[PDB]
Design a protein around this ligand. Structure first.
Ligand code: BOG
Ligand code: BOG
Ligand code: BOG
Ligand code: BOG
Ligand code: BOG
Ligand code: BOG
Ligand code: BOG
Ligand code: BOG
Ligand code: LDA
Ligand code: BGC
Length: 277
């Protein structure tokens, strides 16, 4: 048909309390492009994660992450939309003072059906399920070869200005390859959002309530990545000029109730820009 394209840049931040120092902030630059015809979406992304910049470069384990995906929109229509994504991703780890470690490259393969089913003129049952295989350098990297993920639930529309999404979120890492044991975990949350849609402004308060969560790792005392889920309240802002230029702001406070002397607390901040054409 016609072709559509986007390009954008997002910069995110993730902190931990207190003052302190617990050590001491992540930074997540990233850029994307997508296109754009028909039931076909082509996407590529570049992401990178590491400690808060200050680079001599005396950094700390960081990692970069090319991404490519293609999405096929089988059926779209007000009754029952259905869709699919295959994805490939590469984690390019660079360890900095982790004895026994220099560098890793683990791949992730992704198969994610998605859906939007009408229930009434005010209720929808939308969602995505996502199946992954992770490939090389697992021992080094700690991932677990297989992982399921899904966020699905109900949307109710008060009117063109206010909506309510309440979802079940589930994330299981497990190993298909007995015997490997590394990165096994399970997360369950309820997620609730109230997308406010005020002309060009867009605000969404939201929250994640953990149902049950267990891991194999970050407690006493392992380093941090995927995944990695916390109770949070957050708010997302978004503005569309109709240029084709949008920007966004998001902030979220996350906690973990504990039995130590008190409890671990996190901050997320996140600005984006997107341009359509
Ligand atoms: C893909 C590129 C998106 C924009 C990159 C983020 C721009 C800011 O880069 C920033 O340098 C500054 C040091 O004062 C700080 O504000 C940030 O912590 C640092 O990462
Ligand atoms: C990644 C997007 C590819 C777009 C190709 C379909 C046509 C849209 O843009 C196209 O660029 C092509 C060369 O790049 C030419 O064949 C077309 O004449 C030009 O219109
Ligand atoms: C720009 C739109 C033209 C369609 C691009 C080629 C695909 C047309 O063919 C489609 O592909 C599907 C596989 O994804 C199959 O279910 C069927 O062969 C068909 O519906
Ligand atoms: C045969 C080894 C790879 C050859 C290059 C292209 C074929 C890759 O095909 C497969 O993609 C799968 C995605 O689900 C992965 O699980 C596998 O690691 C891979 O072998
Ligand atoms: C995301 C918002 C959650 C509320 C929507 C689902 C509430 C579950 O309630 C259900 O709703 C159906 C629609 O009338 C009723 O017909 C069912 O009998 C009832 O069990
Ligand atoms: C509208 C939002 C729906 C919330 C549903 C909460 C209960 C979900 O059902 C869940 O199915 C899981 C499959 O992994 C089981 O393992 C869990 O025991 C069960 O709680
Ligand atoms: C994972 C790194 C942070 C990116 C967060 C994107 C915006 C806020 O996270 C939420 O995720 C949902 C996924 O189903 C989106 O549908 C919501 O609109 C969005 O508010
Ligand atoms: C995606 C590309 C981003 C380029 C952004 C360049 C603009 C720099 O952003 C700066 O914001 C500050 C607010 O604290 C103001 O004080 C400055 O006037 C402004 O230049
Ligand atoms: C189960 C229904 C729950 C309603 C959904 C509202 C979730 C948003 C959380 C609000 C936090 C934002 N606030 C109010 C502090 O500004
Ligand atoms: O569509 C929302 C997307 O969010 C991402 O964070 C998930 O990893 C994808 O599987 C999902 O499709």
């Amino acid at each position: 048909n016609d072709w559509h394209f986007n390009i954008g840049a997002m910069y995110e931040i993730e902190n931990v309390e207190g003052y302190g120092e617990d050590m001491d902030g992540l930074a997540e630059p990233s850029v994307y492009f997508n296109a754009a015809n028909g039931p076909w979406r082509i996407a590529l992304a570049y992401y990178q994660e590491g400690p808060v910049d200050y680079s001599a470069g005396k950094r700390g384990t960081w990692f970069d992450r090319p991404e490519l995906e293609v999405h096929y929109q089988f059926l779209e229509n007000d009754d029952f939309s259905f869709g699919l994504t295959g994805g490939f991703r590469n984690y390019g780890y660079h360890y900095v003072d982790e004895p026994g470690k220099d560098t890793a490259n683990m791949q992730r393969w992704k198969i994610a059906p998605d859906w939007d089913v009408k229930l009434t003129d005010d209720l929808r049952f939308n969602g995505w399920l996502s199946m992954y295989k992770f490939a090389n350098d697992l021992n080094t990297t700690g991932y677990a070869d297989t992982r399921v993920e899904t966020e699905t639930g109900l949307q109710y529309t008060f009117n063109e200005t206010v909506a309510l999404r309440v979802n079940y979120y589930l994330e299981r890492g497990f190993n298909m390859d007995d015997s490997r044991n590394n990165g096994e975990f399970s997360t369950q949350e309820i997620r609730a959002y109230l997308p406010l849609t005020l002309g060009n402004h867009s605000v969404t308060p939201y929250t994640r309530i953990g149902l049950d969560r267990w891991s194999n790792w970050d407690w006493q005392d392992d380093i941090e990545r995927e995944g990695h889920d916390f109770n949070r309240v957050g708010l997302f802002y978004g503005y569309d000029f109709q240029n084709g230029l949008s920007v966004s702001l998001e902030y979220a406070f996350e906690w973990q109730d504990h039995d130590e002397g008190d409890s671990d607390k996190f901050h997320y901040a996140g600005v984006g820009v997107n341009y359509s054409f």
